[PDB]
Amino acid sequence: ERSKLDLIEEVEPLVRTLGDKLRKSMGRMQRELDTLQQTYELNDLRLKKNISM
Amino acid sequence: ITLEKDIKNLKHDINEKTQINEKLELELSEANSKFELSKQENERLLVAQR
Amino acid sequence: NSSSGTFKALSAVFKDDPQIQRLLYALENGSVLMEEESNNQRRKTIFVEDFPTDLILKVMAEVTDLWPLTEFKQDYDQLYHNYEQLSSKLRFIKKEVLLQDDRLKTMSQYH
Amino acid sequence: LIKDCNHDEAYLLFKVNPEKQSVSRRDGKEGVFDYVIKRDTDMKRNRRL
Secondary structure (H helix, E strand, O other), X not given: OHHHHHHHHHHHHHHHXXXXXXXXXXXXXXXXXXXXXXXXXXXXXXXXXXXXX | OHHHHHHHHHHHHHHHHHXXXXXXXXXXXXXXXXXXXXXXXXXXHHHHHO | OOOOHXXXXXXHHOXXXXXXXXXXXXXXXXXXXEEOOOOOOOEEEEEOOOOOHHXXXXXXXXXXHXXXXXXXXXXXXXXXXXXXXXXXXXXXXXXXXXXXXXXHHHHHHXX | OOOOOOHHHHHHHEEEEOOOOEEEEOOOXXXXXXXXXXXXXXXXXXXXX
């Protein structure tokens, strides 16, 4: 029961806090993702245009 | 007894300044998150314009 | 000394690498008051997110190793799948976008 | 006096060593098990002295 109490009042709050932090980090990296995609579109258009003329 | 009262009052001051520091650290993490979100949003807008 | 047995066990089983230990300390109280490596030595706070995502993933993987219960194991499986899907897709995106921005630079020298 | 454990819960909570047939917490935290067994072994060794 002491191990269970660690799981639900020590490991459980730790894992919930890790869950919120990792979900905020997932949001962080999908914003890194779409900003890197937007730079991708920038370089792709710049390359295609400059090669075009 | 006076020194014990001083220790208690200074521990209360320690707790108050620790609450202030916790608020400051929460505001610093919030500032980091707000910087990231705001600069990426501005990057999105500016890149759409580009 | 006041840390719970969870972080104590995690630190003990982890190597004495300062990076991982400082990550654990920051996780225990939000941020790490690390000592500046510059000649102007001073204490500065560093957030958990400043640590690389891979180290945090390894920490939580170790946590699931020491607590392998089915809900935790499934949560780690889902989060690691999201890791290797989203962040790793972003990782090929990042490496190939450094390469393709180098292509842009070569183009800009070209025309 | 003696209740059988859920084998799933016991296995997840406890590392089992069949070579010595011992039981420990997976996190390695010392419980009454470690205290009792360590005390017994220390008495055995002090007797060996």
